Amino acid sequence: LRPCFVSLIDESDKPILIYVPNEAENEMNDVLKYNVLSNISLDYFESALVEWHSLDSKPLLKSIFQLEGVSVFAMLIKQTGLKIVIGFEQKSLSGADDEFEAINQIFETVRKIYIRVKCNPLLVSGDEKSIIKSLERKFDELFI
Amino acid sequence: FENSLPKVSQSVYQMLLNEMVPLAMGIERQISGDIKRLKIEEHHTVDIIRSHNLIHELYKADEEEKEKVLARLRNIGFQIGLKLSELLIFSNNPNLKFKEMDLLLIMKFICRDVWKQIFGKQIDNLKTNHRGTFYLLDYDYRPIQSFSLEEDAKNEELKMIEPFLEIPVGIIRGVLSSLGYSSEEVICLASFIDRGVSFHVQ
Amino acid sequence: PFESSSKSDESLGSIIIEGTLDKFQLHKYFFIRRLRLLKLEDQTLTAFVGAFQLIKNFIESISIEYRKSVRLLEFKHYFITSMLSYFEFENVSNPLLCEIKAELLMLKRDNWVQGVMATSETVFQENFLTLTKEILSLFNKCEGKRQRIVDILSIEIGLLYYQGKKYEEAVSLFLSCYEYYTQTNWNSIGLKILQVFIDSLSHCPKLDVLQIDGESVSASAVLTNAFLNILKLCKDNDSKEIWWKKFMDLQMKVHLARANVSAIEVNLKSYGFPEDISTKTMRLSLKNMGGDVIVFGASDFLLKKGENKLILECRDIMYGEFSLLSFEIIVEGITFVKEFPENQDEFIVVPEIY
Amino acid sequence: RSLKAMGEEIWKNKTEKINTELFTLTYGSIVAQLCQDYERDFNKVNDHLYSMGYNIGCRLIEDFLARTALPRCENLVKTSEVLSKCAFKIFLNITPNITNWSHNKDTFSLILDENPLADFVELPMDAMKSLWYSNILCGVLKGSLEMVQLDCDVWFVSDILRGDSQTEIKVKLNRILKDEIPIG
């Protein structure tokens, strides 16, 4: 149920953070094979194969593709133009339908910690390093 | 629909909202770059002014220093407006996507929700020139009901009320620049018709 | 009829899934339900692609169903269930959405084939993968959009070119594409692309540089290596920057202009000395271990320029180096009108004008 | 009848609004202003926060006394009763606890459980050892008690945001003010 990478993309081409669990050991972990999926994920927002219909007020979840044994899921939260991508492999997946709501729990509990981190008053306005550091300690609190 | 989640009093917020203005006058007139009072702390002394004397110091303020004050008020309204809009994001309003091509559709958001959240009530009227200039109206702006005008000196009282208007200037500027850009936005007066203030945007 | 068929197919699939036993033969019932959905969606412009999504999620779910290494061979059967479905999606000459659907189908087939082949023709595997990636790259390039997947596909094709020994390097020749993935927003793809470009320049053994512009230089490796040293992780890989600076010193090719963001220098108060006022002592920090330069901090008057405070010898090898910066020939009889217009350029056979 | 019952009772006739998404970020935005205008000074901000707190406490004591009509307090038993059992109840929906008085009972401490002025702030490294955050509360508890004819002094000891120990405020009677009766 635990993820293999998380990704937050703002309204430009930039990433806010590309965080993987367990950086402390190598363990055949390639950040390179994670960033290529994050680079093509921002491409496949504009694809006509999937679409986020706006009639429901609640932001929804999709399943854009699956490469290298890893399935990724891309919520576009509509209003502030933030793009979020979380990745999971087939061995963590059980293939059921009850897990889909728990995936949406993971999506909203990382959106909550993003809006709580970026609404810190004492950080200076601008893309500091401290937003990245605070995000990764909150993520390592969430993910051992 | 009826969410009863935790809450505090309206009155302490409204009076903190009111004393943000002499906080800005105190932070500008005392920048510590080299009648008042004095207080006793342990091996320590502060020296203060009281609020209404500082609003009277705004009545005797320098002209360039007055607009040096008013940038700070829209800056603090800008900060609380963008952060408050960012919390509204959790509400998941279905009106808008980004960059506000249909500008009045998010004018139907701010009057319905944001002014409801800060001041407990809707904006009662909005008029639409279709060049982007939109005409706000409310009959009673909430944090100036407690400001008592003095006896028959209303020409001073207008000049001492309207520098409290830069905070909702900051509010609507901050919720616009949370959604992408900065365009021109000013105040009005609009003497009310039945027993307060109007706003222009682009 | 179509919406009733979709809703009744979903309800009948759930009702058939309510029966627990015979899950292996239930694959045939799921394929029959998929064929019933495919017969209803026979003429759709975009929704057929959504019906391909009705394939693909089912192609996810069948991938959820079979769980074995030998089921990878059943994934080879899914490759057949790709390819015949490719036969179900080949009924077009040229289109915008059908090209992207064929690109996604070919990417899924190539991912399945690469998963199958890596389980245990080794020279021909690179040629067949390059042919399939060239077909998918042409299909993705035949579109009005999607430059981001095309750039990663071209980087994968250039890495497959680098997977054998090749002197012709498309990614290293595309320093524009390297700067497009390096200038901003990406710090791990660029750190491998610059490593591939530096390795290709190491195995180049040629002085015929890029003909796309006037950039004919044997110090283009050092120009890329400045960005590779700026985008380095830490001082663990400082030997790469030291070796690249040593190669730039040996092959010198002296004209350059660096932003000097790898070095941080801070000034102090102006003073005086004996027979020439040695004002503006400054402390400097650096990443490289050895550096010697005639660093001069210029200063502009109302209508003049001192350009003083240079030191010829610099053996300093630490942060806050505290250079003396002796400043002979004081202009305007040491007036106080001179403001700061500091180049602070530390030329070590190449200028670094911060 | 009891001071618990009155302080809970005012919450049936008090106008209310949300304690997150307003009123936390008001204090956060003004302390961001004080941090950015003094070029990240960490002790002058305490002085200006305590000044604005003194002014708002002296302006708030009248609304507290008009909201519930109470006699003038005289010791640190009735103040320690009235504070923790109606004042933070009707202004912040919280209730602190009282401990660590002296032998003569001329002090106490003010351990607070859920401070709604700092919800998920996590102040940075330089401000963690030389800044107090909630100085608007110490200003209120100076300026409110200085108008019911008691000189006082109210100071932080520790808080959750930088330290493992809880949020508490120390306080001394510092004499009783003499009301001035005659003409001269």
JSON list of C-alpha atoms in Angstrom, two decimals, chain C residues 191-278:
[
{"chain": "C", "resi": 191, "resn": "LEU", "atom": "CA", "xyz": [22.98, 14.74, -14.43]},
{"chain": "C", "resi": 192, "resn": "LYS", "atom": "CA", "xyz": [22.91, 11.55, -16.53]},
{"chain": "C", "resi": 193, "resn": "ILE", "atom": "CA", "xyz": [22.69, 13.35, -19.88]},
{"chain": "C", "resi": 194, "resn": "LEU", "atom": "CA", "xyz": [25.75, 15.45, -19.02]},
{"chain": "C", "resi": 195, "resn": "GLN", "atom": "CA", "xyz": [27.59, 12.32, -17.86]},
{"chain": "C", "resi": 196, "resn": "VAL", "atom": "CA", "xyz": [26.76, 10.63, -21.18]},
{"chain": "C", "resi": 197, "resn": "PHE", "atom": "CA", "xyz": [27.90, 13.75, -23.09]},
{"chain": "C", "resi": 198, "resn": "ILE", "atom": "CA", "xyz": [31.16, 13.92, -21.11]},
{"chain": "C", "resi": 199, "resn": "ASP", "atom": "CA", "xyz": [31.80, 10.20, -21.68]},
{"chain": "C", "resi": 200, "resn": "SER", "atom": "CA", "xyz": [31.09, 10.63, -25.40]},
{"chain": "C", "resi": 201, "resn": "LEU", "atom": "CA", "xyz": [33.51, 13.57, -25.49]},
{"chain": "C", "resi": 202, "resn": "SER", "atom": "CA", "xyz": [36.05, 11.37, -23.68]},
{"chain": "C", "resi": 203, "resn": "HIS", "atom": "CA", "xyz": [35.63, 8.69, -26.35]},
{"chain": "C", "resi": 204, "resn": "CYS", "atom": "CA", "xyz": [35.35, 11.26, -29.17]},
{"chain": "C", "resi": 205, "resn": "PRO", "atom": "CA", "xyz": [39.06, 11.63, -30.18]},
{"chain": "C", "resi": 206, "resn": "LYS", "atom": "CA", "xyz": [38.06, 14.34, -32.66]},
{"chain": "C", "resi": 207, "resn": "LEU", "atom": "CA", "xyz": [38.17, 18.13, -32.95]},
{"chain": "C", "resi": 208, "resn": "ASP", "atom": "CA", "xyz": [35.28, 18.49, -35.43]},
{"chain": "C", "resi": 209, "resn": "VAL", "atom": "CA", "xyz": [32.64, 20.13, -33.24]},
{"chain": "C", "resi": 210, "resn": "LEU", "atom": "CA", "xyz": [28.98, 20.92, -33.86]},
{"chain": "C", "resi": 211, "resn": "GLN", "atom": "CA", "xyz": [28.07, 22.25, -37.31]},
{"chain": "C", "resi": 212, "resn": "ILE", "atom": "CA", "xyz": [24.61, 23.49, -36.26]},
{"chain": "C", "resi": 213, "resn": "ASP", "atom": "CA", "xyz": [26.18, 26.86, -35.33]},
{"chain": "C", "resi": 214, "resn": "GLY", "atom": "CA", "xyz": [29.59, 28.54, -35.17]},
{"chain": "C", "resi": 215, "resn": "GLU", "atom": "CA", "xyz": [30.47, 26.68, -31.93]},
{"chain": "C", "resi": 216, "resn": "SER", "atom": "CA", "xyz": [33.68, 24.99, -33.11]},
{"chain": "C", "resi": 217, "resn": "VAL", "atom": "CA", "xyz": [35.63, 24.45, -29.89]},
{"chain": "C", "resi": 218, "resn": "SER", "atom": "CA", "xyz": [37.59, 21.80, -28.04]},
{"chain": "C", "resi": 219, "resn": "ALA", "atom": "CA", "xyz": [36.49, 23.52, -24.81]},
{"chain": "C", "resi": 220, "resn": "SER", "atom": "CA", "xyz": [32.80, 22.72, -25.37]},
{"chain": "C", "resi": 221, "resn": "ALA", "atom": "CA", "xyz": [33.41, 19.81, -22.99]},
{"chain": "C", "resi": 222, "resn": "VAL", "atom": "CA", "xyz": [34.58, 22.35, -20.38]},
{"chain": "C", "resi": 223, "resn": "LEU", "atom": "CA", "xyz": [31.58, 24.58, -21.17]},
{"chain": "C", "resi": 224, "resn": "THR", "atom": "CA", "xyz": [29.26, 21.64, -20.49]},
{"chain": "C", "resi": 225, "resn": "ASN", "atom": "CA", "xyz": [31.42, 20.58, -17.53]},
{"chain": "C", "resi": 226, "resn": "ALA", "atom": "CA", "xyz": [30.89, 23.94, -15.81]},
{"chain": "C", "resi": 227, "resn": "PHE", "atom": "CA", "xyz": [27.16, 23.18, -15.79]},
{"chain": "C", "resi": 228, "resn": "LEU", "atom": "CA", "xyz": [27.91, 19.59, -14.74]},
{"chain": "C", "resi": 229, "resn": "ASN", "atom": "CA", "xyz": [29.98, 20.88, -11.81]},
{"chain": "C", "resi": 230, "resn": "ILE", "atom": "CA", "xyz": [27.26, 23.38, -10.88]},
{"chain": "C", "resi": 231, "resn": "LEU", "atom": "CA", "xyz": [24.60, 20.64, -11.06]},
{"chain": "C", "resi": 232, "resn": "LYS", "atom": "CA", "xyz": [26.75, 18.14, -9.14]},
{"chain": "C", "resi": 233, "resn": "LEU", "atom": "CA", "xyz": [25.49, 16.62, -5.90]},
{"chain": "C", "resi": 234, "resn": "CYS", "atom": "CA", "xyz": [28.33, 17.28, -3.44]},
{"chain": "C", "resi": 235, "resn": "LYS", "atom": "CA", "xyz": [32.11, 17.00, -3.02]},
{"chain": "C", "resi": 236, "resn": "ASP", "atom": "CA", "xyz": [31.91, 13.20, -3.40]},
{"chain": "C", "resi": 237, "resn": "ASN", "atom": "CA", "xyz": [31.94, 13.78, -7.17]},
{"chain": "C", "resi": 238, "resn": "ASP", "atom": "CA", "xyz": [34.42, 16.67, -6.92]},
{"chain": "C", "resi": 239, "resn": "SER", "atom": "CA", "xyz": [37.08, 14.57, -8.69]},
{"chain": "C", "resi": 240, "resn": "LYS", "atom": "CA", "xyz": [35.02, 14.81, -11.90]},
{"chain": "C", "resi": 241, "resn": "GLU", "atom": "CA", "xyz": [35.04, 18.63, -11.69]},
{"chain": "C", "resi": 242, "resn": "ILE", "atom": "CA", "xyz": [38.76, 18.61, -10.81]},
{"chain": "C", "resi": 243, "resn": "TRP", "atom": "CA", "xyz": [39.54, 16.32, -13.77]},
{"chain": "C", "resi": 244, "resn": "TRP", "atom": "CA", "xyz": [37.44, 18.47, -16.11]},
{"chain": "C", "resi": 245, "resn": "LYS", "atom": "CA", "xyz": [39.19, 21.65, -14.91]},
{"chain": "C", "resi": 246, "resn": "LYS", "atom": "CA", "xyz": [42.55, 19.88, -15.36]},
{"chain": "C", "resi": 247, "resn": "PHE", "atom": "CA", "xyz": [41.57, 18.91, -18.92]},
{"chain": "C", "resi": 248, "resn": "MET", "atom": "CA", "xyz": [40.47, 22.50, -19.58]},
{"chain": "C", "resi": 249, "resn": "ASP", "atom": "CA", "xyz": [43.82, 23.74, -18.25]},
{"chain": "C", "resi": 250, "resn": "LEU", "atom": "CA", "xyz": [45.78, 21.22, -20.34]},
{"chain": "C", "resi": 251, "resn": "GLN", "atom": "CA", "xyz": [43.83, 21.85, -23.56]},
{"chain": "C", "resi": 252, "resn": "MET", "atom": "CA", "xyz": [43.98, 25.65, -23.20]},
{"chain": "C", "resi": 253, "resn": "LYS", "atom": "CA", "xyz": [41.27, 27.84, -25.55]},
{"chain": "C", "resi": 254, "resn": "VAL", "atom": "CA", "xyz": [41.04, 30.58, -22.92]},
{"chain": "C", "resi": 255, "resn": "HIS", "atom": "CA", "xyz": [38.03, 32.78, -23.76]},
{"chain": "C", "resi": 256, "resn": "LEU", "atom": "CA", "xyz": [35.08, 32.12, -21.44]},
{"chain": "C", "resi": 257, "resn": "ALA", "atom": "CA", "xyz": [32.61, 34.00, -19.24]},
{"chain": "C", "resi": 258, "resn": "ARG", "atom": "CA", "xyz": [31.19, 32.09, -16.27]},
{"chain": "C", "resi": 259, "resn": "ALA", "atom": "CA", "xyz": [28.45, 33.24, -13.91]},
{"chain": "C", "resi": 260, "resn": "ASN", "atom": "CA", "xyz": [30.61, 31.89, -11.00]},
{"chain": "C", "resi": 261, "resn": "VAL", "atom": "CA", "xyz": [27.65, 30.59, -8.96]},
{"chain": "C", "resi": 262, "resn": "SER", "atom": "CA", "xyz": [29.90, 27.79, -7.66]},
{"chain": "C", "resi": 263, "resn": "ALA", "atom": "CA", "xyz": [31.95, 30.40, -5.74]},
{"chain": "C", "resi": 264, "resn": "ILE", "atom": "CA", "xyz": [30.72, 32.83, -3.07]},
{"chain": "C", "resi": 265, "resn": "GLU", "atom": "CA", "xyz": [32.74, 35.92, -2.14]},
{"chain": "C", "resi": 266, "resn": "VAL", "atom": "CA", "xyz": [31.80, 38.52, 0.48]},
{"chain": "C", "resi": 267, "resn": "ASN", "atom": "CA", "xyz": [33.53, 41.86, 1.07]},
{"chain": "C", "resi": 268, "resn": "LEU", "atom": "CA", "xyz": [34.34, 43.94, 4.16]},
{"chain": "C", "resi": 269, "resn": "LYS", "atom": "CA", "xyz": [35.24, 47.49, 5.16]},
{"chain": "C", "resi": 270, "resn": "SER", "atom": "CA", "xyz": [37.67, 49.69, 3.25]},
{"chain": "C", "resi": 271, "resn": "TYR", "atom": "CA", "xyz": [41.00, 50.43, 4.93]},
{"chain": "C", "resi": 272, "resn": "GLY", "atom": "CA", "xyz": [44.48, 51.74, 4.11]},
{"chain": "C", "resi": 273, "resn": "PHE", "atom": "CA", "xyz": [48.06, 50.47, 4.07]},
{"chain": "C", "resi": 274, "resn": "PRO", "atom": "CA", "xyz": [51.66, 51.57, 3.47]},
{"chain": "C", "resi": 275, "resn": "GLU", "atom": "CA", "xyz": [52.21, 53.70, 0.28]},
{"chain": "C", "resi": 276, "resn": "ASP", "atom": "CA", "xyz": [49.02, 52.29, -1.38]},
{"chain": "C", "resi": 277, "resn": "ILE", "atom": "CA", "xyz": [45.70, 51.81, 0.39]},
{"chain": "C", "resi": 278, "resn": "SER", "atom": "CA", "xyz": [44.88, 48.09, 0.52]}
]
